Design an enzyme around this catalytic site. Structure first.
Site, PDB file in Angstrom:
ATOM      1  N   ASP A  24       0.794  -1.361  -0.085  1.00 10.95           N
ATOM      2  CA  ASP A  24      -0.174   0.062   0.122  1.00 10.95           C
ATOM      3  C   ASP A  24       0.917   1.264  -0.086  1.00 10.95           C
ATOM      4  O   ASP A  24       0.529   2.412  -0.669  1.00 10.95           O
ATOM      5  CB  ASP A  24      -0.972   0.047   1.242  1.00 10.95           C
ATOM      6  CG  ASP A  24      -2.187  -0.755   0.937  1.00 10.95           C
ATOM      7  OD1 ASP A  24      -2.465  -1.070  -0.032  1.00 10.95           O
ATOM      8  OD2 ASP A  24      -2.726  -1.135   2.316  1.00 10.95           O
TER       9      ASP A  24
HETATM   10  N1  LIG Z   1       1.814   1.566  10.553  1.00 12.15           N
HETATM   11  C1  LIG Z   1       0.537   2.052  10.870  1.00 12.15           C
HETATM   12  O1  LIG Z   1       0.637   2.754  12.285  1.00 12.15           O
HETATM   13  C2  LIG Z   1      -0.942   1.641  10.294  1.00 12.15           C
HETATM   14  C3  LIG Z   1      -2.054   1.567  11.304  1.00 12.15           C
HETATM   15  C4  LIG Z   1      -3.332   1.233  10.529  1.00 12.15           C
HETATM   16  C5  LIG Z   1      -3.375   0.749   9.166  1.00 12.15           C
HETATM   17  N2  LIG Z   1      -1.914   0.614   8.538  1.00 12.15           N
HETATM   18  C6  LIG Z   1      -2.091   0.452   7.007  1.00 12.15           C
HETATM   19  O2  LIG Z   1      -1.274  -0.609   6.756  1.00 12.15           O
HETATM   20  C7  LIG Z   1      -0.571  -0.736   5.446  1.00 12.15           C
HETATM   21  C8  LIG Z   1       0.779  -0.762   5.802  1.00 12.15           C
HETATM   22  O3  LIG Z   1       1.868  -0.429   4.796  1.00 12.15           O
HETATM   23  P1  LIG Z   1       2.789  -1.803   3.910  1.00 12.15           P
HETATM   24  O4  LIG Z   1       3.466  -1.237   3.024  1.00 12.15           O
HETATM   25  O5  LIG Z   1       3.038  -2.667   4.999  1.00 12.15           O
HETATM   26  O6  LIG Z   1       1.192  -2.212   2.923  1.00 12.15           O
HETATM   27  P2  LIG Z   1       0.476  -3.612   3.648  1.00 12.15           P
HETATM   28  O7  LIG Z   1      -0.946  -3.473   3.291  1.00 12.15           O
HETATM   29  O8  LIG Z   1       0.672  -3.805   5.083  1.00 12.15           O
HETATM   30  O9  LIG Z   1       1.231  -4.917   2.585  1.00 12.15           O
HETATM   31  C9  LIG Z   1       1.541  -6.265   3.190  1.00 12.15           C
HETATM   32  C10 LIG Z   1       1.898  -7.077   2.256  1.00 12.15           C
HETATM   33  O10 LIG Z   1       2.709  -7.827   2.524  1.00 12.15           O
HETATM   34  C11 LIG Z   1       2.421  -9.022   2.332  1.00 12.15           C
HETATM   35  N3  LIG Z   1       2.632 -10.032   3.271  1.00 12.15           N
HETATM   36  C12 LIG Z   1       1.971 -10.663   4.390  1.00 12.15           C
HETATM   37  N4  LIG Z   1       2.633 -11.391   5.011  1.00 12.15           N
HETATM   38  C13 LIG Z   1       4.011 -11.831   4.348  1.00 12.15           C
HETATM   39  C14 LIG Z   1       5.105 -12.717   4.543  1.00 12.15           C
HETATM   40  N5  LIG Z   1       4.826 -13.776   5.478  1.00 12.15           N
HETATM   41  N6  LIG Z   1       5.922 -12.833   3.619  1.00 12.15           N
HETATM   42  C15 LIG Z   1       5.915 -12.001   2.463  1.00 12.15           C
HETATM   43  N7  LIG Z   1       4.867 -11.039   2.345  1.00 12.15           N
HETATM   44  C16 LIG Z   1       3.824 -11.125   3.321  1.00 12.15           C
HETATM   45  C17 LIG Z   1       1.098  -9.185   1.899  1.00 12.15           C
HETATM   46  O11 LIG Z   1       0.602  -9.909   0.576  1.00 12.15           O
HETATM   47  P3  LIG Z   1       1.004 -11.383   0.779  1.00 12.15           P
HETATM   48  O12 LIG Z   1       0.093 -12.108   1.878  1.00 12.15           O
HETATM   49  O13 LIG Z   1       0.130 -12.058  -0.578  1.00 12.15           O
HETATM   50  O14 LIG Z   1       2.220 -11.835   0.608  1.00 12.15           O
HETATM   51  C18 LIG Z   1       0.679  -7.771   1.923  1.00 12.15           C
HETATM   52  O15 LIG Z   1       0.627  -7.457   0.426  1.00 12.15           O
HETATM   53  C19 LIG Z   1      -0.938   0.890   5.176  1.00 12.15           C
HETATM   54  O16 LIG Z   1      -1.791   0.698   3.864  1.00 12.15           O
HETATM   55  C20 LIG Z   1      -1.725   1.581   6.080  1.00 12.15           C
HETATM   56  O17 LIG Z   1      -2.563   2.561   5.731  1.00 12.15           O
HETATM   57  C21 LIG Z   1      -0.956   1.237   8.980  1.00 12.15           C
END
Ligand SMILES: NC(=O)c1ccc[n+]([C@@H]2O[C@H](COP(=O)([O-])OP(=O)(O)OC[C@H]3O[C@@H](n4cnc5c(N)ncnc54)[C@H](OP(=O)(O)O)[C@@H]3O)[C@@H](O)[C@H]2O)c1
Ligand SMILES: NC(=O)c1ccc[n+]([C@@H]2O[C@H](COP(=O)([O-])OP(=O)(O)OC[C@H]3O[C@@H](n4cnc5c(N)ncnc54)[C@H](O)[C@@H]3O)[C@@H](O)[C@H]2O)c1
EC number: 7.1.1.1
Lengths: 174, 351, 354
Positions: free
Chosen positions: A103
């Site tokens: 994301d």
């Molecule tokens: N940081 C905060 O304070 C917070 C709070 C609330 C919401 N969020 C939201 O969370 C998101 C965080 O950003 P992000 O860059 O991490 O995007 P993300 O939305 O968390 O993407 C995570 C990706 O990692 C992959 N993944 C999961 N487990 C895995 C594993 N074991 N090995 C390899 N890949 C794995 C997933 O696809 P696969 O399972 O297919 O591999 C997924 O597409 C943002 O959209 C944000 O809005 C963040």
């Protein structure tokens, strides 16, 4: 559309790079892939490659999620940057190593008002020569939307566990 | 146009809605920035550090807020019958932006309506992706999660990490985090980076993975028996389960406290909302059954020097979009869902 | 034999010279273990946990010490001139093992000598590899380094780790550790554990290694590099001590002048004169926007961890001098851990302190 790759050919890229920028996300945390990531990094620095970590504001699932893990893996802080500070450096970097992040790079936030991430600032990882994505499958991230970067000429999917995939890479970088 | 930032007058409140960084960017928007002298002392922000960024320093509160078109405060303004009448010090028709607790503090809302002040309740920020950089709840209770482990460490007569030395080994501290929101996750993070064995639990679903994405163990093998088994060997216990405007749910009862080892502590970050432990008292370090029940009030204010810049830049992210003429005139675009979703009163009328 | 551990009577002393594990080691060696009721309360050790281990509980300090062949204590025995004559409770000709503070506390040495007590000053444990398991200074100063950082973070109104956030980047706190150490090296490690950028200095060359080993930045005539770092520093932890002589002055008052507001100093040598002038013993002073912490008896702030180790140092020091199921203790003189730490003996101060 979808261009797939392996650890063995993922190592052919970053070895043959002059500047690489690491983009870690939530998947990197789930896999606990950070000790291998740091290991992949200093292998390259010992080879002359330029390495840096692009830590995004809302990467992971909490503030500083990525930071504590990298900090534990003994990544030097002088190689870690906030979006605002490195986001322009993707121009010069020829490879973007995206481990478990999704994301955080999605241009739907920059050019699609209907997107539930629209207006959120992202890391411009489509600018760098090649874009690498470590990811178990095609599943979406937290947002629930799909990412355009996946189906691009300069993008390659490295399907698998972020930990194993990064270890396989280190061992292919021998 | 002028924007003013007073000194937080609530007892215990050492944060401030300003930092040297956000002054600079406020000046670049065409603001005359004014702050009460010593308003940021509790956050390690000296008066000259503000003027270094382009701030005007006013001597008193009233001699700074009377002139301001917009007012930035950390926490709701005090009324006449609350101690000091700050609501009265704001200019009529000026814009207010702070943590109000509006849906719980209706009286301060009406006090603002009277004075025809437009108020924006920062804690009612809609949870959208772009508006995460404006969210104060998330920015503030995160540092609460960090503080909890620091306080726990402080109250504990043992070291957190495992230490092998010339004359034997001390074991690591065993931590247990109840409820995993932003605070829980940061506690776990601080606890585990510290060297302790971290356990964590929550009634939420996708928690297990999140907890595991930090090194912690999500308690799952007669269900709370798995919870208990861990809680007895526990040394430090951090509770973070805060229901929105409702009372904090009970997670550690009296007979559960009696089972704990003498020397063990409990950091209860839900005190002010009833407590996750009903045996905890606000502001007090209670001792029962050889167990410290710590219930500090206003926790992010204990990390005031880092909470204030985050709060200031939260406030800045929300405002920046709405300022322009070339850059010297504020108009909050009501179209913007962030504005309409957070506005509580405007022009002597509740919304 | 009969071995006794009293409660520590000195103000703020919460440690105790024993734990349940060391009790089981002592009984096994052929000892009767006496412990004064509630001695381990400050160290989170119940009287129950000691009886269960095999020890005997005495109601009072006198009772526990009356028939004690060997006495284990943390700090020096208090004399009559200090309001509590603890020396008078020890049996004549008995052996004493504690942190005597011998060189700086000569009236206690005579008091013991006058009762013909053979007292071993644990703080003078010679600098050798096998005797480090007997070393109370390291064992305890190691906890002091750890606690020096936990006190830092507790007085610090900022967070230690770096944190990239929707609301901006929380910078990592900047720590400067004065005098590498057991204490210093432990401060370095705990600070880095929390996520701070740690730097460090010391007059000893071979320092770089252990500092860099922990992933800390050893500062590299040379003094101007510290003044350039100290100004950037959030948490300054000083640990430099000298035996007998007062503590070195590593951070002067005008140095404090150049420091950021909301910026802490933990002066661990506060009791030995201090490394910072305005650091006061048993207080937290606020000077020039800089909080100067000078807690007294820092190992007592980690009592529950400090005690069981302290007890092992003694166990380690004692054990090789027990026979094979002969039920007798005899400190082989020709051993250098014995020879070097025996301050007084058989009614005569038999040690370089005429
Ligand atoms: N940081 C905060 O304070 C917070 C709070 C609330 C919401 N969020 C939201 O969370 C998101 C965080 O950003 P992000 O860059 O991490 O995007 P993300 O939305 O968390 O993407 C995570 C990706 O990692 C992959 N993944 C999961 N487990 C895995 C594993 N074991 N090995 C390899 N890949 C794995 C997933 O696809 P696969 O399972 O297919 O591999 C997924 O597409 C943002 O959209 C944000 O809005 C963040
Ligand atoms: O072994 P130990 O830890 O038991 O030794 P120790 O506890 O007696 O000494 C602690 C440390 O302080 C250091 N030190 C002494 N004077 C100093 C000075 N002027 N500047 C910087 N460091 C100084 C020493 O090198 C040592 O590493």
């Amino acid at each position: 559309s979808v261009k797939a790759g392996s650890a063995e050919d993922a190592a052919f890229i970053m070895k043959n790079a002059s500047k690489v920028i690491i983009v870690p996300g939530y998947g990197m945390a789930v896999a606990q892939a950070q000790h291998a990531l740091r290991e992949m990094a200093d292998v390259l620095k010992k080879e002359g490659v330029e390495v840096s970590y692009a830590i995004h504001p809302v990467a992971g699932r909490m503030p500083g999620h990525m930071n504590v893990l990298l900090a534990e893996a003994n990544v030097p802080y002088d190689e870690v940057f906030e979006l605002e500070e490195i986001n322009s450096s993707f121009q010069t970097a020829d490879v973007a190593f995206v481990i478990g992040a999704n994301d955080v790079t999605n241009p739907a936030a920059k050019t699609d008002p209907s997107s539930p991430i629209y207006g959120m600032p992202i890391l411009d990882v489509e600018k760098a020569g090649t874009v690498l994505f470590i990811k178990r499958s095609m599943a979406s991230g937290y947002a629930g939307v799909e990412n355009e970067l996946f189906f691009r000429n300069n993008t390659m999917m490295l399907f698998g566990d972020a930990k194993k995939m990064t270890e396989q890479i280190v061992q292919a970088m021998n | 146009m002028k924007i003013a930032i007073p000194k937080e007058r609530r007892p215990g409140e050492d944060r401030v809605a300003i930092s040297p960084e956000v002054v600079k960017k406020l000046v670049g928007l065409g603001f005359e920035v004014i702050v009460e002298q010593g308003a940021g002392v509790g956050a390690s922000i000296t008066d000259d550090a503000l003027t270094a960024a382009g701030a005007t320093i006013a001597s008193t509160a009233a001699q700074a807020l009377s002139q301001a078109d917009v007012v930035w405060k950390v926490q709701r303004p005090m009324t006449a019958e609350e101690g000091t009448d700050e609501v009265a010090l704001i200019k009529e028709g000026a814009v207010l932006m702070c943590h109000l607790g509006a849906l719980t503090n209706r009286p301060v809302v009406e006090a603002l309506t009277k004075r025809k002040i437009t108020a924006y309740a920062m804690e009612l920020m809609p949870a959208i992706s772009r508006a995460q950089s404006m969210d104060i709840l998330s920015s503030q209770s995160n540092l609460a999660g960090y503080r909890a482990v620091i306080d726990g460490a402080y109250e504990f007569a043992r070291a957190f990490p495992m230490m092998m030395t010339a004359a034997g080994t001390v074991p690591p501290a065993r931590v247990l985090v109840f409820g995993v929101g932003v605070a829980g996750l940061q506690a776990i993070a601080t606890a585990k980076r510290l060297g302790a064995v971290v356990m964590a639990t929550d009634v939420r679903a996708a928690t297990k993975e999140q907890v595991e994405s930090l090194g912690g163990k999500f308690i799952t093998v007669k269900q709370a028996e798995a919870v208990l088994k861990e809680l007895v060997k526990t040394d430090i216990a951090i509770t973070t389960a805060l229901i929105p405007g409702k009372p904090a749910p009970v997670l550690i009862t009296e007979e559960m406290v009696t089972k704990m080892k003498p020397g063990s502590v409990i950091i209860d970050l839900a005190v002010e909302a009833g407590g996750n432990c009903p045996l905890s008292e606000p502001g007090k370090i209670v001792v029962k059954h050889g167990v410290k029940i710590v219930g500090h009030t206003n926790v992010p204010s204990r990390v005031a020097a880092d909470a204030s810049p985050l709060f200031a830049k939260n406030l800045l992210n929300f405002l920046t979009p709405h300022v322009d003429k070339d850059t010297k005139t504020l108009v909050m675009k009501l179209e913007d869902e962030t504005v309409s979703g957070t506005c509580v009163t405007r022009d002597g009328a509740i919304v």
